[PDB]
Amino acid sequence: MLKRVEIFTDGSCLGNPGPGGYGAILRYRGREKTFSAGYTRTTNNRMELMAAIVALEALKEHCEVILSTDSQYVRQGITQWIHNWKKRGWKKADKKPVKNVDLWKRLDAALGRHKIKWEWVKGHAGHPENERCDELARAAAMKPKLEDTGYQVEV
């Protein structure tokens, strides 16, 4: 019987773009482990992705993951865009590069190593783990220690 793990993620910025942060809760057999980190300058989308990335990468063996988030950016990514992007070797129709391809590739990579089961949520109501993640992300964004080297900023 494959290890079953639940993952909750959320990421955001104190003004977008701006100081950002993410928070993830990885639960297993009633025991939970927290994950968080703050960056000097980044965007909401990157954080939403980072959260899922770090959590998934934390796993050290094949598992059955039940990933839950309220991020539409990640939702649409996984549900639609992600498939088409890979076909065109990571490049939109108008030849423009896909945004945050660095993090997307990383997420995809991590995803393929487990049996994911996505669960898209609406608000905080009836979703305590997620609310908690949001809390983690904000606190981390208050005093960021890391730096998002993959963030371009751009003129």
Coordinates of C-alpha atoms in Angstrom, one line a residue:
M1 CA 0.0 0.0 0.0
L2 CA 1.6 3.2 -1.2
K3 CA 2.2 6.0 1.3
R4 CA -0.7 8.4 1.2
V5 CA 0.2 12.1 1.8
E6 CA -2.0 15.2 1.8
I7 CA -0.5 18.5 0.7
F8 CA -1.9 22.1 1.1
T9 CA -0.3 25.1 -0.5
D10 CA -0.7 28.8 -0.9
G11 CA 1.7 31.7 -1.9
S12 CA 1.3 35.5 -2.2
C13 CA 3.0 38.9 -2.2
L14 CA 2.5 42.0 -0.1
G15 CA 1.5 43.9 -3.2
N16 CA 2.2 42.4 -6.7
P17 CA 5.0 42.3 -7.6
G18 CA 6.7 42.6 -4.2
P19 CA 8.1 40.8 -1.2
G20 CA 6.5 37.4 -1.4
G21 CA 6.1 34.1 0.5
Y22 CA 4.7 30.7 0.4
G23 CA 3.3 28.1 2.8
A24 CA 2.7 24.4 2.5
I25 CA 1.4 21.8 4.9
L26 CA 2.4 18.2 4.3
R27 CA 0.4 15.8 6.4
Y28 CA 0.9 12.0 6.9
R29 CA -0.7 9.6 9.4
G30 CA -2.0 12.5 11.6
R31 CA 1.5 14.1 11.7
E32 CA 2.0 17.4 9.8
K33 CA 5.1 19.1 8.6
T34 CA 5.3 22.8 7.7
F35 CA 7.2 24.6 4.8
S36 CA 7.5 28.3 4.2
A37 CA 10.0 30.8 2.7
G38 CA 10.0 34.5 1.9
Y39 CA 11.6 36.3 -1.1
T40 CA 12.8 39.9 -1.6
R41 CA 10.9 40.5 -4.8
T42 CA 8.6 38.0 -6.7
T43 CA 5.0 37.6 -7.9
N44 CA 1.9 36.0 -6.6
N45 CA 1.9 33.3 -9.4
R46 CA 5.5 32.3 -8.8
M47 CA 4.8 31.9 -5.0
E48 CA 1.7 29.8 -5.7
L49 CA 3.9 27.5 -7.9
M50 CA 6.9 27.5 -5.5
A51 CA 4.6 26.3 -2.6
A52 CA 3.6 23.2 -4.6
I53 CA 7.1 22.7 -5.8
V54 CA 8.9 22.6 -2.5
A55 CA 6.2 20.4 -0.9
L56 CA 6.3 17.8 -3.7
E57 CA 10.0 17.9 -3.9
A58 CA 10.1 17.2 -0.1
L59 CA 8.8 13.7 -0.7
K60 CA 11.6 11.2 -0.8
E61 CA 9.7 8.2 -2.3
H62 CA 6.8 7.4 -4.6
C63 CA 3.5 8.3 -2.9
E64 CA -0.1 9.0 -3.6
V65 CA -0.4 12.7 -3.2
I66 CA -3.7 14.7 -2.7
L67 CA -2.7 18.2 -3.5
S68 CA -5.1 21.0 -2.5
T69 CA -4.9 24.7 -3.4
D70 CA -7.2 27.6 -4.2
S71 CA -4.8 28.9 -6.9
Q72 CA -6.5 29.5 -10.3
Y73 CA -3.1 30.1 -12.0
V74 CA -1.9 26.7 -11.0
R75 CA -5.3 25.2 -11.8
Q76 CA -5.6 26.5 -15.3
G77 CA -1.9 25.6 -15.8
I78 CA -2.3 22.0 -14.9
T79 CA -5.8 21.6 -16.3
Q80 CA -5.2 23.3 -19.7
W81 CA -2.1 25.3 -20.7
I82 CA 0.6 22.9 -19.4
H83 CA -0.3 20.2 -22.0
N84 CA -0.2 22.5 -25.0
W85 CA 3.0 24.2 -23.7
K86 CA 4.9 21.0 -23.6
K87 CA 3.8 20.2 -27.2
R88 CA 5.2 23.5 -28.4
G89 CA 8.3 22.9 -26.4
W90 CA 7.5 25.6 -23.9
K91 CA 6.5 28.5 -26.1
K92 CA 3.2 30.2 -26.7
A93 CA 1.4 30.4 -30.1
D94 CA 2.7 33.9 -30.8
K95 CA 6.3 32.6 -30.3
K96 CA 6.5 34.4 -26.9
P97 CA 8.2 32.4 -24.1
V98 CA 5.8 30.9 -21.5
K99 CA 5.9 32.9 -18.3
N100 CA 7.7 31.2 -15.3
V101 CA 8.9 28.3 -17.4
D102 CA 11.6 27.7 -14.8
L103 CA 9.1 26.9 -12.0
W104 CA 6.7 25.2 -14.3
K105 CA 9.3 22.7 -15.5
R106 CA 10.3 22.1 -12.0
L107 CA 6.7 21.5 -10.9
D108 CA 6.0 19.2 -13.8
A109 CA 9.2 17.2 -13.0
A110 CA 8.2 16.8 -9.4
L111 CA 4.6 15.9 -10.4
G112 CA 5.7 13.0 -12.6
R113 CA 7.3 11.3 -9.7
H114 CA 4.1 10.7 -7.7
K115 CA 0.4 9.8 -8.3
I116 CA -1.1 13.3 -7.9
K117 CA -4.8 13.9 -7.1
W118 CA -5.6 17.6 -7.4
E119 CA -8.3 19.3 -5.4
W120 CA -9.2 22.9 -6.2
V121 CA -10.8 24.9 -3.4
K122 CA -12.7 28.2 -3.4
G123 CA -12.4 30.2 -0.1
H124 CA -11.0 29.7 3.4
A125 CA -14.4 28.5 4.7
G126 CA -14.2 24.8 5.3
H127 CA -10.5 24.8 4.4
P128 CA -8.5 25.4 7.5
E129 CA -5.2 23.9 6.2
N130 CA -5.3 26.3 3.4
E131 CA -6.1 29.3 5.6
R132 CA -3.1 28.2 7.7
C133 CA -0.9 28.1 4.6
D134 CA -1.9 31.7 3.7
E135 CA -0.8 32.7 7.2
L136 CA 2.5 30.9 6.7
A137 CA 3.1 32.7 3.4
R138 CA 2.3 36.2 4.7
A139 CA 4.5 35.9 7.8
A140 CA 7.4 34.6 5.6
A141 CA 6.9 37.5 3.2
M142 CA 7.2 40.0 6.2
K143 CA 10.9 39.1 6.7
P144 CA 12.1 37.4 3.5
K145 CA 15.4 35.6 3.7
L146 CA 15.7 34.2 0.2
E147 CA 15.8 35.7 -3.3
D148 CA 13.9 34.7 -6.4
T149 CA 16.7 34.4 -8.9
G150 CA 14.2 33.2 -11.5
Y151 CA 12.3 36.4 -11.4
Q152 CA 13.1 38.8 -14.2
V153 CA 11.6 42.0 -12.8
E154 CA 11.9 43.5 -16.4
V155 CA 12.3 47.2 -17.5

